[PDB]
Structures are given as C-alpha cells and as structure tokens.
C-alpha cells in the first residue's frame, strides 16, 4: 500500500463573516502565503504526493484555481466537492474513489503546525501497518476540540467530541493518519445528535478495538489557532516573526518540494523566473544558487 | 441627488504574490472585515452614497458577487472595469459617464483611514464649491508617494510623484476631491515618465490654478496603506486593538448606514441575519437595541 | 512652570507579577519610550510645566535618577512617595503641599492618551474657572472602571466605581481637572468597600454640587489599556505602527517642549547625542535643522 | 557537586535608550515574565543548578531582590558586580572564582530559545568532556552576530565577529559551553576595536586547536531577538502566543524545578499560595493538581 492524503477545507464559514462571505477561509493569508500551503507542506513533509482536496461548492474551484493539477511542484494534487458541512468523517465518503485501497492522512485546511523534527514526529504514524494514528496537543480550551482523556499511566482512555466537561486538557489536532479501514467504518457512520458525521466517533472506533495511537505532541511545537478573526492575525504574526528573524519560509512548498527530492534545481529556475520581480520570486531563486 | 465617488481597487496585485494569486487584495481580511469595507465606509461618512467601483478585468465581479447594487446599505454601487492599471488618473476617464456633471471623489481601495473628527475633515473637502482637495500625511517613506514641497511660510508650493529626492515628508494621501474639471483634466494628460497617468499632474493643475486645498492631516490621524504582507497584518493589528478595547468598530458599512439615517432599524435586522451566528452580525443587532 | 499636574505612579504591582516585582509598572516600555513618558507628555500638551510624580518609598527614587529635576526639559519636576496605594484620591493628600492655592490635574501614571486635537480637547479643562472636569470614554469593559450614567438627554447623572450592573459603557478616563476644592474633599474622604480612597468620590462630589463637566472622549482617539500583560503589548504594538508609518513619535517629552518653545536648539542637541546610536536621538536632532 | 553556569545580565543597553535608562534589560518583560528568567530556564533545562548572575553595579541588587539565593527553587544562585561593561568574556574573569576548576556554561541574559527537545539539543554539549559547543542558527542578518562558516563537509572553519562579509548566514546564538580552559583564555584576551573582550575572540581559540563544536539548531527551533525595540514586542508576542493557546508558560523557573524534581510539590505549593491573588500564582497552584 501507500498513502494518499487529503485536506478537507470546507465548512460553512459562518465564525468568520464577513471576511469568508468574499474569501474562503482556507485562502486567507497567514503572513506571506494562502492558508491552505501550510497544511499541504504538512503532507509533503509526511512524504505524501498524492493529494485530494475537499472544499464546498462555491470554494473548490478557487483552490483549484490556485494550485492546479500540483505538477508544478512535483505532486498530483485533485478535487472534490463537500455538498455541505456534515461532518469532517465524510472525507473518506467523498474521497472514497480516491484512496482505492490504500491508507491516508487527513488534515484539516486551517491547521498550522510549526516546530522541531515534526517529519520524525509523524514518522511512526506514516510507517504504520494497521490502525490509526492521532495527536494530542495541551491547550486551554480544550472544550472547542476532541478531547483525549489519559490514565494514570499515559494511556488513552476516552475521547469525547465538545464536551462540556473535558477529562482533559489534550485536545486530538486536525491531522490524522489511517489505515484502508476507514472508509467503510465512515461509510457505516451515523450522524451524531447535532447532525454531523465525526471524525471523533470514527477514532473512538479503533480505540476501542485497540488500534489508536495516541502521539503526544509537545510544548515545543506550535500549533496554531485559526478559529477566530484574532487568531488569524496572531498566527500571521507569528509566522511572520520566524521568518524575518531566520530569512527563511515556513511551509513553503517549492522549497520542500525542492529540498525532498520532488523537483529538481531546473524545476525551481523554472518557477522563479516568471516572479523574479518579487519577494517570493527571488526567495525560490536565491534556493537555487546558495 | 446623492453625492458621487468611486473606489479604485484595481492593480495587479504582484507585489503580494501568491497572497494575491487566488484573491483579490482589496477583498484580503483587515482583522474582521474585506479591506474595501474601508474605503468604503470612509465615503459613506463623507456623505457619499452613489459609488462606482472600478477594478481589473478579473477581479471587478467579484466585487460584484459580495456587495450587489448596494441598495441594503442604502447606497447605490456599479461597477466598471480598468483593462491595464494605466494610472490613477484613468479612474476618472473610465468613470465619465459616471460622473457627468457633478463633483466626484477617489478614494484607493487599499487605503485605511482612522481618526477623532475624521467625518468633519471629509465633509468640509465635499462643502467646497470650485477646486480640489487632496490631505498630506507626514510619513517615513515620502519616495513611494506624490511628495508636497511647502514656502518658508507652511504654503504647499509644489507636487513631484514619487521623487528620487524628495523635497518633505508629507505624503498626499490616498483620498481626493475634486468638483467636475476633473475629467477634461483627465482626459488631456499624457503618460508620465513611469508611464502612468497620473494624478500628482491632475493635483498640479489645480494647484498652479490656485484652487488646490492641501489639507494637513496631523498626527493624530492614522493613515495606512496595505502594501506589504507586513503592513497588512499591522492594519489588522491596529484595527483590532482599536475594537476590542472599545467594543466598537471601525468603518463597518452597515453600521456607517444606519447612523447616518441611510438605512433603518427594520433593514439593520434584515442585514444581520446572515451574520448572526457570530460577533458581526450580533454587534448589527445590539446596536438596534443600543 | 506655573500650572501643576500630578503623575500618580505607584501601585501595588500585584496584577503583573512577576514583571512588576523588581521593576515599577510605570517605567516599562512601551514600544520605545518609559510608559511614564506618555501621561507626562499628556500634562505638557496641557501646557502644565510643573509636574509632581508620586511613587512607591523603591521606585521614587528610581524615576528621579531618571528625569531628575525637568529642568533639562523645561519642567520642574519633583516626588514624593506614597507609602501605600491606599487609593488614586490620596495623590490630593500626599500633593497637598505641591497644589498650594492653585488649580491643579491629575494623571495616571499607566494612562495613555492618543489622538486628534487632544492638547483642544483638553483646552476648556484647563480654563475651567472652578469646578472640575473629567472625560468618558466607550469601552466594551465598563465593570473594570469607574462608570459615568447619562440621562435621556446627554446629562451625566451617575457615577459609580467597578460597578457590577454597569448603567453604561463609558468608562471615566484617567485624566481629571481640579480647581483647589479637592485637596479638601480628598482630605475629608473615607475609603471604599474595597479600602480605598476613591477618586470616583471626589467626582461624585463635584457632580452632587453641580460643578462636574463630563467630557466625551468620542471613538477617534485611542485610550490604551495597559492593566493586563497582553494589553501592554497591544499598547506598544499600536504606538510602534504609528510611529513607523509616520516618521514622528507619539508622547516624546523632548519634542513636546522643544516645539511648545520650553527648551532650545542647543539644548535638544545636547540631549539628543547620548541617545544618537538609535532612532530617539536621531529623531530629535533632526528636528532641530531644518 | 552541581554543575555550574554564568548568567550575564549587565551592559549598558545604549542601543535601547531611553527604554534602558530606567529599567535592565535583562529585567524588561517577555510578555509575563522578567526578560532574564528565560536565560535562566534554559540553564536549568540543562541540568546547571549552581548559577552566577553578573549585572552593573546598580542592577545586580535588583535582579538579588528578584532572585534571591534561589534555594527556593532548588538552585544555588550568587553575585557579582562587572563595574564596566567591558565584554562578553570578562564572565570568565569575575567568574574566576565560582568556577573553580570546574567546566562552565555562559549564557547572555537576553538570550531565549524555544522548541522542541532543547534538553536533548544540549545534552552533547553538556556532557563534553574536552573543548567548548557553541550553537549556530540561520539569520537574515548574519552581520550583527559571530558568524560560523563551514566548508562542503559541515566543518567549521572559520569565526569572526560582525563580518564586513559575512562567510554565512549562521549566527552564533548566546548560548555556550565551556570546559575549565576558557579562564586562562580569557585572562589573556586584548579589547575590541569597541572596548570589550570579546567571546568570539574565545571562541576562535578552541576553533583553532579543533575543539570548538558548532552544534546546528534546526528552523524549527526560534531564537527570538531581543536587540531593538520593535523585536522586543515581537518576542513578547510570540510567547503569548504559544502561551495563550497551550495555557502552560514558557521558561517558568518554579515548573522546571518541579518538573526536574529540584523541588517537590509541597514546596510549589508554599511559592504559591502568598501568589495565588495573582494569575502567576494560580498556575504555580495548579500545576500540583490535575
Ligand atoms: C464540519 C466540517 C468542517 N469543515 C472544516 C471547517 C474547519 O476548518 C475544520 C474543523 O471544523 O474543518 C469541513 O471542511 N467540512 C465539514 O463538514
Ligand atoms: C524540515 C522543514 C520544516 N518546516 C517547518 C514546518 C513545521 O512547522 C516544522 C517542521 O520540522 O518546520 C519547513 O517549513 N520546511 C522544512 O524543510
Ligand atoms: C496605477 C494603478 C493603481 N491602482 C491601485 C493599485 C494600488 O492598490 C493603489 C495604489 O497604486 O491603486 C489601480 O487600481 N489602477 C491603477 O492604474
Ligand atoms: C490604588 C492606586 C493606584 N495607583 C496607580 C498605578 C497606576 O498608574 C494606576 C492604577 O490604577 O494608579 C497608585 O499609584 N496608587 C494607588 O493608591
Ligand atoms: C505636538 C505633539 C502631539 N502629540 C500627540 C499626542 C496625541 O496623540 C495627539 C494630541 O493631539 O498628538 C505628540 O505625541 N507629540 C507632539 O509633539
Ligand atoms: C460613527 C462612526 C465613526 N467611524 C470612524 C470615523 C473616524 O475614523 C472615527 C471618528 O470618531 O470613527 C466609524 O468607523 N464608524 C462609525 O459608525
Ligand atoms: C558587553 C556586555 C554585555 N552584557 C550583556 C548585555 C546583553 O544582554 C548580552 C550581550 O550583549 O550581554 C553584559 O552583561 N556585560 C557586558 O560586558
Ligand atoms: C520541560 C520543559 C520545557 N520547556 C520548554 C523549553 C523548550 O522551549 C520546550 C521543550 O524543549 O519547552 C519549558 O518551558 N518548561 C519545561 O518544564
Ligand atoms: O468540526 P468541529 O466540531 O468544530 O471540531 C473538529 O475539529 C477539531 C480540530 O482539530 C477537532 O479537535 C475536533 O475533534 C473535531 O470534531
Ligand atoms: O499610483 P501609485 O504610484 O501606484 O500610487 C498612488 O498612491 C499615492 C497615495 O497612496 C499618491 O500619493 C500617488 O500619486 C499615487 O501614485
Ligand atoms: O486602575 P484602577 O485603580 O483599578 O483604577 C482606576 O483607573 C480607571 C482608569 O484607568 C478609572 O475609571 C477608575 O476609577 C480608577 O480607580
Ligand atoms: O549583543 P552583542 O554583544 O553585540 O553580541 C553578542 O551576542 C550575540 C548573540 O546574542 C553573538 O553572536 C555575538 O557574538 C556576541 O558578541
């Protein structure tokens, strides 16, 4: 087998209005490039070419207007269309056809990871045989997310979408990684109380069979918020403080593709040479030379 | 009988790349709001309610698509494409039927402005009755703007367009008034030495004709433009530092509408209907009940 | 040096511990100046030229290394310690001797003011014969100051302080004018719930007498926050977007009282070279040619 | 016994006048905390317990008030006064003493480090034997710093202090380690074309005789600048960022000592209750519950 990914970037938009009601979320700057590059260099960094992207019926035809067919950039990158928000588990639905029999890694569009090693921190889930693999990160409102409630030995015991009462303060991020099974125990899926098809009730799944790992990912790591307007802007600052301190781009795919092997130096000359004029332009040139 | 202005929020939009490759720049998010909900508003309190946008060949309808006729602000907005970004000077020529014998002003669709009494500012540039009035802003970086030269005594004496050398620090902001000349104005320059039509020449003429108003607009104000990825995340900073404190907003249009009797409580409600599940669309509602 | 204004700059700097813990609240930065330096700027905008800074019995000697006498600046500053922040009315108290016969104001140390006209603002304050005056400002926080009621027509009518079910959101600024009726009241005051001599009082004092003016602070100007770590942060990085953009500083003493005519052309350059290496002092010696 | 680290926190600061007129720089805040207090984390996260602090003659009583002898945080900390501000490398010399014969760590006071497995990125140089491990992190402004050049093979090969032409883009950070041969080399060094004996000049010695080990830090690591006013705001706000969305702090001295096992809950618990009137001390609190 090998694995194919998917970002869903959907969702109704509704916690950003006005802003989404002209730009999809996921299209949105985060300092010096459109959201959706940071959890597709996320995948790249897995080593994951393949790619389909799940947006809405208005949105998907601007992501693929932006990025293509991926050749550019050494992937093969394609799209479906999310009828309505019903439920971040009715991915595997959509890209049922896509995934064939192979394994997958999600990832949701808005989700922003930054930090030391994360290549080797997904690692294991990449290489993994069977199961699912998710990961657990400390943070103060963990009842906006899937909580991941831990025994007394650092075990997983219980997860819970949105509780009103969190076991923990782990919450499950948006990447994850699975293997063929997914798709049926999605398609199997019922809808919760509040309508959606979750992705939290597919992990409880393997947990209760006892085929989810849980990976923590810790306080070294950044994973930034993008839920509100101020996020948003913190997030764009944040990355914006790396960069100009290093004068390097965090989640720039041309230069992972680059650096991995995906594409070669001619490639990069290629892409750089119609946007020498600017900033970005000369940052894919100036990889070529030194 | 509404007073008259027009947007001009065309551009290429390479300087942002690839920000800009899948989204118009004047539709980019400035904290909570498509940035020309700015300009926009700063028209609305200068009185001015029969607004034609103009922007590039692509990007003109999606302008249309969020913001319609118009009528639920109590405006009335068209639409006009510029085929190249031939010069600021050129809105004036696309919009001669627009305009027909009335005074017009311009406000760019990337500019931001804030300050106490800035509805007064405005409202005594739209009173006068022959000539033009143009507002300058002392900056940092003169040289990327038209530059005022001032007389011992503090009398604007000459304007340069982006001067190698420039002769103060006072930039001419990005908004302007002018009664009807402005058109046969337009219509008789010829390309500058950057090729552009530009209006430094259109402010010259008045000025030499002795009928340019060069209102200063002091420190106190703050004035900015959106031209780098850092600058636009410093406008978002700004604003939102402004809002929360206060719990008010910055140049939100429905708002604008309401408090100057464009639109009624009845419509207000309407308008936030959309927008009610989140911070937007309550703060519309609030205000109909305080 | 003739009219008197009070910089109350003490505190019990519990809120920002550890920060606070060795260091006064009011000589942290903000952005690129002491945050002293900004309501000091404020009463020299007044044209009040003789200032006394009350601080804690560790930190009053720590501002007078720093300013010394104001003579440098065209000022006559001096201190005095309060041994314990029983309360902003006890500055009235400690001030006594300082006010003598005279009118006076008061500022707190942690507040700063920006924006359009302020010095015309505060203008009928400082000519107020007798009475006093005090400025409202909208916050979306009412219930952390104290809260200035009005009436159907736009008659103050209430004040309260912290108030659990606050009657409106204008906050009372803290910035406040006093003829020399407030020594006396001050002196005749017992303290709070919350143990402490209240300014609040006072204001409630005057307005019983029917000599309180309540001056709207309207949405134009900025009152920044500085009681939480991350409102101090939000307070440098709105000064630093002003400042960058403009070239100019926000609330530097030197400039203030080299432009209101207190000190010279040499004595700025004097000034000015100690602080050369960076910006401040280049921008000062700047302002004296030409 | 414990391991030894030198901590210098003195400087005259010019480069941030006036801001450090009044307050060290080493005591500024990095959004909740006193700017030293992540120096020192990072010697404790290395296992370093027994500490000199070095500041001027004013400060070093300052940061004594703020510190103390530490033993409440399970630390040794001393003190020592530089007079004048005469160079990194005069650690070595006022350190003389408290050193001893044994191997030492120096970290500069405005140096913070974040990420993931710093305890790891420094186990080597911790555990050295022979020689001396500097780290070296890629910056868009090499010429500020000691630049580190290496040859095709990732050898270094040659260091110097502020290159004219800097041979590389890699900085070397405020962090270093020393076996007991840096005394002698210290006592032998001659002044800066600035007057300071010079810790590169240290360095180029071990480097020469093929002992000086460049341990690269990865991107995914950030090294925040402390050096001008306006990335002093950015350090602050990339803390709170990673702050305010984990809910756990950044560089806590009382946490790591708990965590390390320096200290043991009941003694967190006695930090914390004359505290818990603060939102510092409810985190000390809580960290010995859920
Ligand atoms: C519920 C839902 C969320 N989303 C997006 C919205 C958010 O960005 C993220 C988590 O809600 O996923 C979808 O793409 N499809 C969905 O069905
Ligand atoms: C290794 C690598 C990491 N990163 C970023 C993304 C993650 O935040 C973290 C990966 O270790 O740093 C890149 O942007 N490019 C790279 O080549
Ligand atoms: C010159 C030019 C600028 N613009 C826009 C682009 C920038 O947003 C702003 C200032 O150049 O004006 C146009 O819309 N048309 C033009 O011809
Ligand atoms: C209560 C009190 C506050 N303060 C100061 C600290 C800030 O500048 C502001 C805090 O309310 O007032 C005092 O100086 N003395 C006091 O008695
Ligand atoms: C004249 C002057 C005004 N101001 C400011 C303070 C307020 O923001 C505004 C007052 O109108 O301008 C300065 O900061 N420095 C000055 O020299
Ligand atoms: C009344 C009002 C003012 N403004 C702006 C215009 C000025 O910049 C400032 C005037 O106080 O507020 C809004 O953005 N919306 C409003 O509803
Ligand atoms: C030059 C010098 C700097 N310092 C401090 C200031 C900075 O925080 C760090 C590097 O400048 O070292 C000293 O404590 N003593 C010194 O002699
Ligand atoms: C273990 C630990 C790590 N850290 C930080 C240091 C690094 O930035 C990252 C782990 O390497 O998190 C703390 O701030 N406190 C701790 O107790
Ligand atoms: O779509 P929701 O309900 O907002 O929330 C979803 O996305 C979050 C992002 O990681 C996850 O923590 C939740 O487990 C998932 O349910
Ligand atoms: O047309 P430009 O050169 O692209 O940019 C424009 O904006 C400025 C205001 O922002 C004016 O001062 C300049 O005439 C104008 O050229
Ligand atoms: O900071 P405090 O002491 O809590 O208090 C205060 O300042 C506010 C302005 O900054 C005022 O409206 C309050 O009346 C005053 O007591
Ligand atoms: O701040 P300084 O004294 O100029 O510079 C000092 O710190 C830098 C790290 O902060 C080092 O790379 C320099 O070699 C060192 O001399």
């Given at each position: ?13 509704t916690?950003l ?36 992207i ?19 950039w050494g ?27 192979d394994?997958?890694?999600?990832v949701?569009?808005?989700n ?11 690692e ?23 909580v991941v ?9 219980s ?20 293997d ?7 398609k ?16 409880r799944?393997y ?84």
């Amino acid at each position: 087998k090998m694995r194919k990914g998917i970002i869903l970037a959907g969702g109704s938009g509704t916690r950003l209005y006005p802003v989404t009601m002209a730009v999809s979320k996921q299209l949105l700057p985060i300092y010096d490039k459109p959201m959706i590059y940071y959890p597709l260099s996320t995948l790249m960094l897995a080593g994951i070419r393949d790619i389909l992207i799940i947006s809405t019926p208005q949105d998907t035809p601007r992501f693929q207007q932006l990025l293509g067919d991926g050749s550019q950039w050494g992937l093969n990158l394609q799209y479906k269309v999310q009828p309505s928000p019903d439920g971040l588990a009715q991915a595997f639905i959509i890209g049922e056809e896509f995934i064939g029999g192979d394994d997958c890694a999600l990832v949701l569009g808005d989700n922003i990871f930054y930090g030391h090693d994360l290549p080797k921190l997904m690692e294991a889930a990449v290489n993994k045989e069977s199961g699912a693999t998710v990961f657990a990160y400390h943070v103060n409102d963990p009842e906006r997310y899937g909580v991941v409630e831990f025994d007394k030995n650092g075990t997983a015991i219980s997860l819970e979408e949105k509780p009103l009462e969190p076991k923990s303060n782990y919450a499950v991020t948006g990447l994850y990684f699975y293997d063929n099974d997914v798709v049926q125990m999605a398609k199997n899926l019922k809808p919760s109380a509040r309508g959606e098809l979750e992705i939290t009730d597919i992990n409880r799944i393997y947990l209760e069979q006892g085929r989810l790992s849980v990976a923590l990912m810790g306080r070294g790591y950044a994973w930034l918020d993008t839920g509100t307007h101020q996020s948003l802007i913190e997030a764009s600052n944040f990355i914006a403080t790396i960069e100009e301190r290093q004068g390097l781009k965090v989640s720039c795919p041309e230069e992972i593709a680059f650096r991995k092997g995906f594409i070669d130096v001619e490639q990069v000359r290629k892409l750089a040479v119609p946007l020498i004029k600017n900033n970005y332009g000369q940052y894919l040139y100036k990889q070529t030379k030194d």
